[PDB]
Structures are given as C-alpha cells and as structure tokens.
Symmetry: C3
Subunit: 579 residues, 3 copies
Amino acid sequence: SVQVDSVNALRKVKGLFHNQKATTTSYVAGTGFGGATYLWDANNTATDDGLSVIRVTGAATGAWLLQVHNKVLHATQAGLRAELLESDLIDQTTILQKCVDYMALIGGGVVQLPKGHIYAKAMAKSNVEVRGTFDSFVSVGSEADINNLRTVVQTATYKHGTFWHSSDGSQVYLVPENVTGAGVSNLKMLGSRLGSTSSNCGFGIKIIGDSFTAKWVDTSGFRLEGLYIRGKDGVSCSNHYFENCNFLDARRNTAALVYCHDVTFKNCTFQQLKPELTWVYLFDIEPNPATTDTVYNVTLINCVFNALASAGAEPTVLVKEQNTPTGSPNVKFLNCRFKGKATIRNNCANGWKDCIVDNCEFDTLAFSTTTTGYVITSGRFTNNTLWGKDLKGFSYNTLVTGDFLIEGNRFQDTTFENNIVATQASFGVNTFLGTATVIQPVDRRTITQQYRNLPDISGVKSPINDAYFNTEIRNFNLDLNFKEVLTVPLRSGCKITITGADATTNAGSKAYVELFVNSDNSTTITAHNEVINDPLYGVKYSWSGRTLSLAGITLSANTFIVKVDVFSALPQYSKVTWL
Amino acid sequence: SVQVDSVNALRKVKGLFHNQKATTTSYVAGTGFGGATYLWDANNTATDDGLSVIRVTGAATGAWLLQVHNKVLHATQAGLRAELLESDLIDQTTILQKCVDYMALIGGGVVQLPKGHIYAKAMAKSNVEVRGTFDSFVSVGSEADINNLRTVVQTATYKHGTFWHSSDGSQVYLVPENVTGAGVSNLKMLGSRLGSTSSNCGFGIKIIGDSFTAKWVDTSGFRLEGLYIRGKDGVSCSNHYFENCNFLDARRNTAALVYCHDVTFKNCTFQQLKPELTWVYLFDIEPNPATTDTVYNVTLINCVFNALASAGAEPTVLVKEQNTPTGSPNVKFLNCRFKGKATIRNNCANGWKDCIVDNCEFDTLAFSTTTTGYVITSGRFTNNTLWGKDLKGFSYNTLVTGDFLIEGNRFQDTTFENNIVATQASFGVNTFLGTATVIQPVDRRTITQQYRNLPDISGVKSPINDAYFNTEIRNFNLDLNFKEVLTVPLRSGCKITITGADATTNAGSKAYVELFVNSDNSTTITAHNEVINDPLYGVKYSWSGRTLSLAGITLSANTFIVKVDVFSALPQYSKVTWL
Amino acid sequence: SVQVDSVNALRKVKGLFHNQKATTTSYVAGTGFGGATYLWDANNTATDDGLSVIRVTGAATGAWLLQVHNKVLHATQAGLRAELLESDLIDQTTILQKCVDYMALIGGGVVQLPKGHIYAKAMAKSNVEVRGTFDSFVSVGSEADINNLRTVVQTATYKHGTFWHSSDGSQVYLVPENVTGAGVSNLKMLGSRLGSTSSNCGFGIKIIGDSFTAKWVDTSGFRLEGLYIRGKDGVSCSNHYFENCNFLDARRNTAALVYCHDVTFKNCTFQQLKPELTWVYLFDIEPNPATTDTVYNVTLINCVFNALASAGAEPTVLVKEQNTPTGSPNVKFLNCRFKGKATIRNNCANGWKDCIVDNCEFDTLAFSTTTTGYVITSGRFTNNTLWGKDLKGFSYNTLVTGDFLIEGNRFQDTTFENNIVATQASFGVNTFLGTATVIQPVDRRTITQQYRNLPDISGVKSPINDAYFNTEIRNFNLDLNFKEVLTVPLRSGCKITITGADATTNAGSKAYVELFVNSDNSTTITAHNEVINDPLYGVKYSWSGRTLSLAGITLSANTFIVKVDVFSALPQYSKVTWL
Ligand SMILES: [Zn+2]
Ligand SMILES: [Zn+2]
Ligand SMILES: [Zn+2]
Ligand SMILES: [Zn+2]
Ligand SMILES: [Zn+2]
Ligand SMILES: [Zn+2]
Ligand SMILES: [Zn+2]
Ligand SMILES: [Zn+2]
Ligand SMILES: [Zn+2]
Ligand SMILES: [Zn+2]
Ligand SMILES: [Zn+2]
Ligand SMILES: [Zn+2]
Ligand SMILES: [Zn+2]
Ligand SMILES: [Zn+2]
Ligand SMILES: [Zn+2]
Ligand SMILES: [Zn+2]
Ligand SMILES: [Zn+2]
Ligand SMILES: [Zn+2]
Ligand SMILES: [Zn+2]
Ligand SMILES: [Zn+2]
Ligand SMILES: [Zn+2]
Ligand SMILES: [Zn+2]
Ligand SMILES: [Zn+2]
Ligand SMILES: [Zn+2]
Ligand SMILES: [Zn+2]
Ligand SMILES: [Zn+2]
Ligand SMILES: [Zn+2]
Ligand SMILES: [Zn+2]
Ligand SMILES: [Zn+2]
Ligand SMILES: [Zn+2]
Ligand SMILES: [Zn+2]
Ligand SMILES: [Zn+2]
Ligand SMILES: [Zn+2]
Ligand SMILES: [Zn+2]
Ligand SMILES: [Zn+2]
Ligand SMILES: [Zn+2]
Ligand SMILES: [Zn+2]
Ligand SMILES: [Zn+2]
Ligand SMILES: [Zn+2]
Ligand SMILES: [Zn+2]
C-alpha cells in the first residue's frame, strides 16, 4: 500500500503492479484537504487533469486513477483550495467544472465543497448535486436552563461555511436545458464576484433544466436575482423544489420565475432587508412580454415575504399569468407571512383566475395592484389575518368579481371605506377587530346568480303538495287586431293583471284591468274588473273558452304588461299556455 | 495489508494477524469490478457464501470477512457480472438475491448495480433499495450559447446505464407482503427475459408490501404491467411514492393499481407509444371483481398520460371504486396532461364519488365511459383545458349529477350537442373558445336544491324589519256544513283568496272570492269581494271573530284553494293558524 | 501503516512521520466495535477527548486525529458499548453527546448508533441526525407461494435493533431552541431509564428547535409523551416532519403538540393499547393556558389513532386553538383511521374554525366534546365513514353552526336522535346505512342565508327581460298631517296596498286600501279601491303627480303597512322612490 503526502509526490512514484493502491495525505502537501485513493494504470496515456488522471512525470506512460467512493467527490480532490477568505480572489472555475463533469460521467452523485469562499462558476450536469459544508455549530447553555426557562437559552444558530461566488458577472450555478435531477445544498451564494468591484454577479441559481432541488441555501447580494428560473421551448423546466432556503437581498428581485411550471417553496424566505441596496420588486413571477414564457402551478407553503422601504423599490410579490395552458397561474400562498412592506400584486393583464391565499398573515395591504384595471377574476381568500401594522386598507387599486370569496379572515383595523372590492367580492363569515369596517356576508358568486335575479316563475305551495300558486309575466305589444295571448289551464283559478308600461309621451297606454277565471275539469266561468281603462289608450279583451285575446285601441298605446296568477291543486294545472 | 487480484486468490491466503486488512482488485480476476475489503478471522468456521464469508480452501478454520461501507453493497462484490450486453443471456438471480438478503441481514441499505444488462429477478427485503447506475452524461454547447439562444443548445439528455431484466416470465422485482420500506431507483427495467423470445416477463415491479419508493425508473416491454400493486388481506400495502418514473409500453397496461391505498405519482409518465405491440389500457385502477381488492387515496401530480391508437387497445385511464372504506376512491388528477388518445374512464359500478380533475390538459375527450349506465356521482372538474385536437366532445357515454361541478375550464371547440352531461352537471363560469357549445352557468347541486323548489311560505319584508308580507296556501275539501279553516293573527291586515281547483267534470267548484281582515291588538273588521261565486258550485264563508269557516253548496263542488296574504309589523303576527 | 487493537494501544505509540495512517481494530480491544482511522499530528497539543483527539501519553505533544468519512460517525468510535441488554444499566450519555457535539462541529451529518439497548440522553445539535440499526430481516416463504396464495405467506416483519433509553427521568432526545435540521431515524425509544424502576423517563423526543425530521421511529413506555413539541417565544418551532413513526403507550399522551406550527405526520400511528398503564389522552394538541403557547397548521395524513378503554383515560384526539395568528388551528385529518375508542375532541374555548376531516374512518363517535358549550364554528366533514362498531352516535355533547358542512359521508347505523348537531350543521348528500337516522340535505350556511330569509324585494320577470314585477314593503307611522311617502316611476303600472298593523288595543288602525297608478313617459292616471277604511281609524291619501302622500285620522291609529307592486317593461322604471 502506497502512502504519499500530496499529488506532486504521487507524480514521482510508479505503481508496482496493475491496480496498486495509493493514498494521498492531501492534494497540496500539508493542507489536510484533498486526500484520495488511486489505482495504478501502467499503460495510461490520457492527459493529466489533476483529478481523475494523475500522470507520473518521471515515466513515459502510467497514471494513478482516482477512485470515487459513495458517489461523493470532494472538490479539494481536484485541487480546489479550501478555507479561503473572500479576499483570496482566486478563479477556480475550471477545477469545479471538472468535478461536476467527472461525476456526471460516472453516474452522478455529489460534488462536496469545503468551507471557505470559492470563486468558481459551474454548469450543472444531470444527477449531480453541489453541496457545501456548514460552519461549526457549538450550542450555548445547560440542559437544565433550556428545559426550565421560557426565555431563549440556546442562542447559537447554524451558519454556512461554504460561500460560493462566480468568476464573472453572469451566474454562479447555471442549470442548462435538458439537465435533469441536478441540485445544490448546504451553502450560501454571494453576489460579489471576480472582475468587478462595483457590479455584482447577475444570478445565483439560473435554472433552464428540469427537476432541480435546493435545500439549506441562502443567496445574497446578486445584481439581478438570487434564483432565476427560465426554461426553453420544447424542453421541460419543471418539478423544482426548494426547502429551508433564504433568498435575500438582490438588486432586482430576490427571486424570479419566468418560464417554468410545478415549483414548490417550503419554509423558504424572500427578504429585501438592505434598503441602501436599491431594488425593484420582492418576488417576481413575470414571463417576459411577447415571448413563449409561461409560469403556472406554483405553491408557496410556510414562506416569509419581507421587505423594508427602499428608494424606487416596489415591495410586491407579483403574479403574472401569461399564455398558461388553463388560463390560471395556479399559484397558491399557503401558511405564508407577508412582513414589513410585503404585499401581493396582481399583474395579470387578462385577469387572475383562481387566486388562492389561505392562512396567511399580512402586515399591510394584502393586495396592491399597480396597473389600473387589472382584475382578480376568481379565487378564495380564506383564513388570513390582516394585521394592519402599516397601511390599514384591504387593497390598493384592486378589482375583483363575485367569484372572489373572502371568508374566515381576521381583519384587524382593516378599512374597506371607498374600496370597490367591498361591493364586488363574495363575503362569508369574517372576524372584524379594532376599527375594522364590518362587511355583512353577501353572496355574489356566479353559480348562485339564478337565486338573486328576479326569477322567471314565482309562487308558493302547500306542504302537502296539493295546493299551488304560480305567477308568470310577459310583455305584449298590442295593435288594433285581437290577438290570442294565452290559454288558462283546467282545474284552476286564475287572475290576469293587464297594465300599461309605455315609453310614449302623453299617448301611451293607460290601463289596470283584472280578469278572473275558474274552471273545473271542463267548464269555465270568467269575470272582469276594470280599475283603470282609458277609452282611448286602454285595452280590449275577449275570451273564447279558456283562451284570452287582447287588443289595443290606439296604436301609440301599445305596450302592456300581462301577469297571471294560477291557483291549482296539481303542478300539471299550474301554468298557462303562452301563445 | 494484503492485496490480491480476485476472490479465488483470497481463498489461498491466510491472514497473518487478527483482522488483517485484505483488498481484492476484482471479484473475478481481470474484470476490474467487484473488488472489496475484507478482515481476517482466524477462528471463523462459517460456510463460504462468495460474499460475506470467504473461506481459505483447505483449512478447518479461517475466513476473510467482507466489510460493507456506508450501507451500500455493490452487487459486483458478490461476483455479479457488469457491462453485459442484452444478448448475454446470463442468469444472475442467485447472486443478486444474496446481496439483497445479506443487506437485510445487517440493517438494510442499498444494493448498488453496475452498468449493463442484468438478467436477475429479486425478491425485495425490508429497508433495502436496489439502485442502478446512470450512463455517462456529457453536455453539449457553450455557456454563452446556452444563455443567449432561445433555441435548444444543450441537447444531451440523461440515459440509464443499468438495464434490469428477469430470468423468467414472472416479475423482475417482487415486493412481498410485510416487506416494508424497500425501493428501487436509477435504472431501466426491460420486459425481455431469459427462456423465451416471444413471451416477455409479466411485471417489472410487483408490489405486495408497504411503503415502497421508486425514483428515476423506467419500465418498458413487459407482458402485463411495468408496475403492479396488489396487497393481501390483513397486511398493509400503502404509502407508495413514485417520482420521475416513466412507465412505458406494456402488452396489458403501463401500470396497474389493484389493492392498495395512499399512492402518489409525481412527475411520472404513462405512455403506450408502440402501437405495433398491442395492449389493453393505458393506466388501470382495477380491483378484481368478487375479491376484497380495493384501491383508494391516489394522487397523480404533474403526470403525463399518452397513447397512440392501436388495434383493440382502449386508450383510457380507468378509475374503478370497489369496496373502498368511504365509498370514494379519492383519486385526484392534478396538473396532469392527457395526450394523443388518452382519456379518463369511469369504471365505478356504484358511481364515482368526489371525482377530482384540476388544472389538467386534454387533447381529446376528457371522459370516455365504456360501461353504459355508469355515473360520476359528484366531483369537481376545475381549471382544465379541452384542446379539442382530436375529438371535439366533452365526453362519451358519460353520466353525472348536479353535484359534479364544471368550473373555470377552457373549452376549445368543445361540443356538448346531444351530451346529456350538459343537462346534469352544475356549471360555474367557464371559457368557451372557437365553436364550443356555450353552456350558461346553472346550479344543480343537492345542497342548494331547496332554493329551486317552490317554497311553503313566500313574501317580502322591509330592510328595517318592521314590515312583513307573508303568504301561505292550502287545499280544502269542503262539504255542506261549515268548517273552521283558519284564524288570522292580531295586528295585521289579511287578504284571503278562495278559488276552486276541482277535478270533477262540469259540476266542479267555481268561485273566486276575496276576504279582507284588519285587526289591531284586539279589534277586528272584515270585508268581502265575491268576483265569481256560482250559486250551485260556489263557496260559503262565515267569520267568528278572527276564525274563518267555509262550506260548499253542492258536494260535487268540493275542492277549493285558500291563499292568505298577511301584512304585519312583527313576525309574531305574520302568519295565520291553520285549523 | 500502523494497525493496533484498540484506542488504548494507540495512546502508547508515536507516529513516525507527519500524517501517518493508523487503524484501530476496535475502540476497546477485543470487542469488534468502534475501529476507526487516525492521522498522526506530531505538533498537536489539544486535549485528549477519546474521540477526535487521541493524545500519546507521556509526551508533551502529539495526537492521533480521527478521520470521519461520509458525514457518518459511528458512536462506537467514541467508545459506545454495542449490543447491550436492557438489564445492562450502563450510562453512555457523555459518549453520545460527544458524538453529536463533534459532528455539529465539522458540518453536521449522522451519528450512527449500533444495535442494542443504549442508556444515553442527548441534546440535539444543528444538522445532526441520530440513526439506529434495524435488526436483521429474514423473509419467510417461497416466491411461488407468495405469488399464488392470497393468504399471507411472507410473515416476517421488520424489527428495530436499536433501543434508545434515557439515563434519568427527563427526556431521551432534547432539541433545544435554535437547533435546526436535526433528526432521528431507524430506532425505538423506550421509557425505562436508569435510576428508577417505577418512574419512567418523561419524554422520548422533546422538540424546542426548528425543522426536525423523524422516520421509522417508535416510542413506547414514557411517563409523559413519546413526542412533545413546545418552542419558545421569538424562535421558530416549525417545519417538522414525521413518517412511518409509531408513538405507542405513554402514561399521559402518546404525543403532544404544545407550541409549534407547520407539522406533518404521514403514515404514523398513535396507540394506547396497554390499558393497565393508565393514561390521560390519546393525542393532544394543547397549548398551556395563560401562556404564549400556540399550535396551528398541522396535517395528519393516513395516520391511525387507536385506543382501548382504560380507567380514567379519555380516548380523545384533542385540538385546542389558542391565540393562533388566523384564529384557526388549521388542523386537518386526511385519510385517517380512528380505531377502538378513539374519537376527536374539540377543545377550542373560542370555537373551532375550519375543522377538516376528510376520507377518515371512525369505529365509534366521530366527536366527543368534553367541555359543555364548546362549538365547532365552521368546517368540512367530508367522505368519512362512521362504522358504528362501538357507540352509534355521531357525536357527544358537540355543537356546530351551519358553516359546518356534512357531505359525502357513510353513516352506518349512525343515530342523530336528540343530537342538536342535526339541527345546526349543513348537510349535503350523505349515505345512510343500516338503522341510520336519515337526515335530508339542508343548507344552513351563512353565505347563502340571504336566500332563506324573506328578501327585501320580491317578484317575477319575463325570460325576455322586457317585463318585470317588483314588490317592496315599508312600515309607516302616520300623524294627522299629510306626508309624502313615495313616488311611482313612469312607464309602469303600480298597485299600492295600505293596511293597518297597529299594536294599540281597541283604537288601532283599521284599513285595507288599494291604490292604482298607470303612467306612460309623462302622463299619470290614478284610481282607488277602499275595501276597509274606518272613518275614525283609517288612512287618508292624496296624489300630487306621481308622489303619494298619506295621513292618519286619529293619532292612536298610526301604524300602517304600505306594499307597492310595480309592473314595468324596463329595470330603470321598476321601483318606486321611497321618500
Ligand atoms: Zn459505491
Ligand atoms: Zn472536502
Ligand atoms: Zn467569509
Ligand atoms: Zn468557522
Ligand atoms: Zn462580501
Ligand atoms: Zn413541462
Ligand atoms: Zn403545455
Ligand atoms: Zn382551485
Ligand atoms: Zn366556506
Ligand atoms: Zn353555494
Ligand atoms: Zn297583431
Ligand atoms: Zn264591466
Ligand atoms: Zn308605445
Ligand atoms: Zn473496464
Ligand atoms: Zn457506516
Ligand atoms: Zn441496450
Ligand atoms: Zn458497482
Ligand atoms: Zn454507455
Ligand atoms: Zn392500510
Ligand atoms: Zn414518503
Ligand atoms: Zn421530489
Ligand atoms: Zn377500516
Ligand atoms: Zn374532496
Ligand atoms: Zn367556485
Ligand atoms: Zn263535515
Ligand atoms: Zn270534486
Ligand atoms: Zn257582498
Ligand atoms: Zn466525504
Ligand atoms: Zn456502528
Ligand atoms: Zn431488547
Ligand atoms: Zn437480533
Ligand atoms: Zn414560525
Ligand atoms: Zn420537509
Ligand atoms: Zn405574525
Ligand atoms: Zn380551508
Ligand atoms: Zn359539495
Ligand atoms: Zn345493525
Ligand atoms: Zn308628520
Ligand atoms: Zn271611492
Ligand atoms: Zn298605535
């Protein structure tokens, strides 16, 4: 068994036999980082890559071949310098890319990064995850105090040990199209980068590929976004999952979804807490105009959106539906907290269909619609609390329809004064606290609109179903000829009311005439009561059996309303026949 | 430390001291795979198993004991042959089963398979995962082109390196009852098998046990199903999870659920795209008739169902409720895509309760009910798109009730002509495009049916709740003697309308009589208005205080309807007492 | 390369060169457990800790430094004693805490426990998981019998090999505040503890920190709870996940949530099946009264709650909302099974808002409210089955509102007799089986209450929308001076009914007066019909154009009801102006 102190020492030692074992103490002698296990290949003439092939310098052929165990490659085993400070401005892009590429060659797995600042941009490859190292965690306080005191005793919190920068202004971690199952975890990404002291790196994570996963990742200081997801036509950009991530200050948005679907954030935060670093929005779902960009099926569970006021900044969480397959962005805010200035912005030009906000908290306005005229077409705003710590309104410049349901919410000091949403939305039970404007429950949903219009038939019946009263009403344009208008049923008593409703000035119809009928199974008696019947502008009526005919007297007096009340013992005899 | 080239060489070497380390270069000399680490046990008398115990041949005592690291056993470390072609018809079942059995013996973990074609059927054991090896991934294109071009530049996609076949026609991976927490990942399973060139292996994964997990697995070419789940009575078959799996062509169904509950598919596909290989259905939830089989609580999230036409094949995704505890299969299609000929089939003999289809896309009919008479009893068909690329209809041979809600959907050219579903379902707002049959919103739900019937009491009230109009109506069978019929309340004005509604021919009742009452807190005045009152067939009335009595004149004229209109300032005085 | 038999021997040997490799056969000589790899540091002056630093005794400098691979430290490599019996009363707390503390120092990972009983309490540290070792699994039965027989053939089930006890009566696993990302898996926790044979350990897992995860963990025999979650003010106690866990018998509750949010249980069970070991509740969500404790956002998916009767035990699953941010505890029971005596208890003093029980099974009462007067304010009780195996009732001592929806359930022999819930809740379609009390569907929801009250306007219209009948009603207190009361619209016929509804004795108003109006676009005709109009106690009316004025005749006769019927052709002319 061969044991040397560095890769340079390995290059001076030849293997005795095929696949002899060699073990390096470190990559660079005396650092304690980068040690690995190698197998001797006497015939190898591949190019020395400082990673998988270690060519012996004192021989014409021969190499020590890296053995990766447990599908984890430590980047230090390719020569990456560990535990560097941010002031060590060393481009290690080529080394890190070698690690990702080589793991992707041998079936995927994990590229482990050490602690330290690393300036090295990487192109993700399928089924490879880049993983950092948490800094040391040392708890504070005794078990007794932790158990007995309600105050905080264990004050130590975890800290990232890996700080991943880019070598230029583009991105740190690019996930190309058709790259699937890649990931990143357990590190912090920083916007400061090689090549410029004033202009930071554009993106932390830029996702074009599919099924990306990130856990315990923070992003801070990026020139555009910490996270940016935009696929391409014809290739999947979907099934992305983020948990325990903190997308912090960025000069445009903390994060942006531009072209993707089926994305989930769980226990992640989005925070613009550096007001001196001016920015644009907080969290932005914004497909680019006049492109095939589309975003839909996004779920944010137990996330925090938090913003402090900043010069020129709009503290909004934007949802922009564009060219989605169903017409809904299917974006759900569940168990989320909007803190500081954070608020939801409807950016849907063709209306926001099925907007979902449930069990969320709002420090200020729940909705702030910048574009006048945008509408939330439908949705459910349930079990939320508007704390009213800042602004006291429900929304700014927002429009909804009756298919937007507001139910189960806690309104602390929430005012709906002069807010048209209060006359548009459906309200169920809600709780009004402090000085909140109490809105009585009111149904404005489309599914129930037939119960709110005047119906086309009206009446009442006996609980025994042997007595019925039904009333219908028709508009009649009468001329001077008698016209059959209706036939009353048998076994019924009917009252017909005829009155004018004419739009003519002076010469319109004037009449209020009651006609009465009672019939058994074959025989009919009628009677009349002319309360008002102008001899020039009134109405003429005539019975032929059970068929009523009407006529006007003067053509200008032509518009009459005819209402029928039918009393019967069975529904079959409850309605007239209109002719 | 000893280092030999194979296990056979290890059998010829004794350890110098207790627990001396030995390293095999390969399992079989010169193959380059399966090498492992062993520890010397001078006292060991166990049987050589070619895996964990390597006995020195020719001695009563002495063995080299395998050292498994990180709960991962490479199957090659039991002699399994790697890198084989599909034409290498080599049964390795015994070797693979030894690895699974041994890992289950020492606490579970992973059995790692190499790249290549492997003919070896395995019985899963608890807490053991079988994992293959991805083939090498090498991306295409420069970072600049990937970032700058909207066209696809990175064209390389991941490929499986492990192709797992069976050694006979049964199944590749059997998960017995009471085997819990097993899994499979990162491989492709193929239906071609040893012993027959014409009859393929029945199943890829056959699951009888509990809490199974599969990720990044494809199934293709199986004689029955790529995936088949059927538990047994008294043992759990539940909590199964599948992600990033592709269940491809099979001669019966791509996958089938027969007896199990709480199963989730996320970002999986079900595809019958080999029409020349005839098949039965696309995806089948089908408990066997006349058994205890039952399937319920199934969620398909962001899945693709895709089928091309094939002779005798039905391109359906079938849901069959049978013996479920709640009467609902609780099957949800969320964010799914039905492509080609794919369509949902209701196969519930006792009705499909709470059918859920949300944010799904349909290339053709959404529903195709093969069995005439089957009903979708209730559910929500929300936020879906019917593209109408193939057939333009909503459904075939399908029946629903008013508790099936159709809302928020996008209907491109969808025709409901002659489709009874349009007269059965509840419709909310929907979007109708092209030549789609515009269905007005209409509520047919059971919960609201009381708003669509005629009420037993009717009227109107003031917004101040100090003025009421209430009307009730009754049928009376009168004889020649007076009978008490009602008592009007105090503090009210009342109008009683009495009219005939008799089924007798010629000799029935004829009357239209209006009675009026006004009372303060104690005093009552009455008045009458006989509009129609036949001297033989009319009605007689008499007041005793506030109690009205009625009588007929001739027995054949006996059926009268009595309607009361009550005007009052308080609800307590708003209704008569019917006697 | 040095290889010695124990750590003790390592302390007696100095390394020859920098970073020489040393390998111990065991930690303690001859045990077969705890061997590890060390690197020589000649300069080291750190303190010997029996784990990471092994100082050579008798020298001022020099130490062997532990090499941890793969982020897994085996506790045996710190001297932990493996495979001990429960009767081996050996405290290993100091060793286990060292392992957790050291892994948290070098970036987190896993502390692997061996098989056996271990008495050792541990304080969790961030991003560190404690993992046990399953006992051996050996399946039973042939593949043929497993595949061909519908009866259970594979009878072997997984067994824990690690049994984790406490060293005293407090807790086994404490997760302090600000400790994040810790976990436990693959072991069993037992309440028996060192120092007392009669008083067991209080808690198995006590969680104060954030983002805890447990999988395949059982807890049994604890004096208080197997699982207990209570955070502190100002620090997150959230995002906790449990899967495949069994919280068994405990002397108070199997598990309790006291101060936490966003907790998920999937495929877990909660079972009090040892009635001889008396207990308090089954599963308890209970913030302490008069504290800042609060619990919300809890999901239980496919869990089992199972209780046998025990003297003094209440077999309840309690939900207590207290000071939650939205007023709803947001607790969901999905796909769950309540077995034996298990039943849900509403323990919300302020009402249980948005109670969710869906696709659950109940062996007995679904709800048992111990505190008389507690209400379920709203919720959805959908797709559940009440088997009626024990008690036949739906609930005990429970109160709901109409915003509690009961729909899609299967009521087997469920009796609602004398249960006020049947008169309070909203009922949709439900299935009534056996001797069950059939409850008709009835809507009692607040959102639709405007369809059940008398409306403030009533009438009927034509399907062509060119004929309308609208009626309104008002209360008038008239004096002796004429008072303008209304103005009838143009282009309409109106019938005004005026009648008394006076509460005065003897001297109240008496009138039934009908007034009629017809107008075209400018001209108006009126008529009157005084059916009742007392000369002393009646009403006076006067028209000025379309404005009606009313006056009384005697001050004591002052209360009049005025009903207006408007007939029109246009909505603009369908209503009077009330003055
Ligand atoms: Zn390996
Ligand atoms: Zn490293
Ligand atoms: Zn730093
Ligand atoms: Zn540090
Ligand atoms: Zn910096
Ligand atoms: Zn997609
Ligand atoms: Zn699409
Ligand atoms: Zn929805
Ligand atoms: Zn509701
Ligand atoms: Zn409704
Ligand atoms: Zn005409
Ligand atoms: Zn006349
Ligand atoms: Zn006219
Ligand atoms: Zn090879
Ligand atoms: Zn290990
Ligand atoms: Zn192949
Ligand atoms: Zn291998
Ligand atoms: Zn290949
Ligand atoms: Zn089950
Ligand atoms: Zn799971
Ligand atoms: Zn996933
Ligand atoms: Zn059951
Ligand atoms: Zn449902
Ligand atoms: Zn709706
Ligand atoms: Zn009689
Ligand atoms: Zn008769
Ligand atoms: Zn008279
Ligand atoms: Zn490592
Ligand atoms: Zn161990
Ligand atoms: Zn034991
Ligand atoms: Zn054992
Ligand atoms: Zn929190
Ligand atoms: Zn989680
Ligand atoms: Zn808050
Ligand atoms: Zn809800
Ligand atoms: Zn419903
Ligand atoms: Zn019975
Ligand atoms: Zn006055
Ligand atoms: Zn008069
Ligand atoms: Zn009075």
